């Protein structure tokens, strides 16, 4: 489905952190610690990237597993149906633009 | 651990935020996995 | 239940709710314990 890998525990953290430091200025001020986390992990502090979304973004797509991954991510949706622009609009809650 | 460190105003802000995000997630899931075919639910408005 | 209030205990949800109810961190909670009772030689209390 669409924006469903809702790792609530992740999000609870993401929001609390923004509440404690909206500009991450303390992070800037504490490089010894800030440098311990990968920038990709830090992306998730501002970005809505849950551990699973991260795992998805890091998947290797190759010809050898393209169908396998399709079943892993889209499951029973026929790729032909998915391919229809209208289906996608709904699937991902996107505006026409 | 982190939640416990918030003040009241922040906690209320947090809870409101999270509930809104939770709804979008529950709704998206519901439509795909729970909604029954007889109900032509193709959107959150239809879900409503 | 034994609630481990040692400042470095990395506790459970009960430890956390106390922090939230009190609006304090682990270090403060540990000292708080010692303030109320200096005979508690552990960081642990019962959920009394």
From TrEMBL, chain C:
Official protein name in the record: TcdA1
Taxonomic source organism: Photorhabdus luminescens
Residues of the full protein shown: 534 to 581 of 2516
């Amino acid at each position: 489905s669409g924006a469903t890998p809702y790792h609530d525990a992740y999000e609870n953290v993401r929001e609390v952190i923004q509440l404690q430091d909206p500009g991450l200025e303390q992070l800037n001020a504490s490089p010894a610690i800030a440098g311990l986390m990968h920038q990709a992990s830090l992306l998730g502090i501002n970005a809505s990237i849950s551990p699973e979304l991260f795992n998805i973004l890091t998947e290797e797509i190759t010809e050898g597993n393209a169908e396998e991954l399709y079943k892993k991510n889209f499951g029973n949706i026929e790729p032909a149906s998915l391919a229809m622009p209208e289906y996608l609009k709904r699937y991902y809650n996107l505006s026409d633009e | 651990v982190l939640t416990a460190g918030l003040n009241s105003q922040q906690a209320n802000t947090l809870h409101a935020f999270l509930d809104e995000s939770r709804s979008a997630a529950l709704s998206t899931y519901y439509i795909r996995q729970v909604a029954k075919a007889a109900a032509a639910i193709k959107s959150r408005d239809d879900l409503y | 239940e034994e609630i481990d209030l040692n400042s470095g205990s990395t506790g459970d949800w009960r430890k956390t709710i106390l922090k939230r109810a009190f609006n304090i961190d682990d270090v403060s909670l540990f000292r708080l314990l010692k303030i109320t009772d200096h005979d508690n030689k552990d960081g642990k209390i019962k959920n009394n």
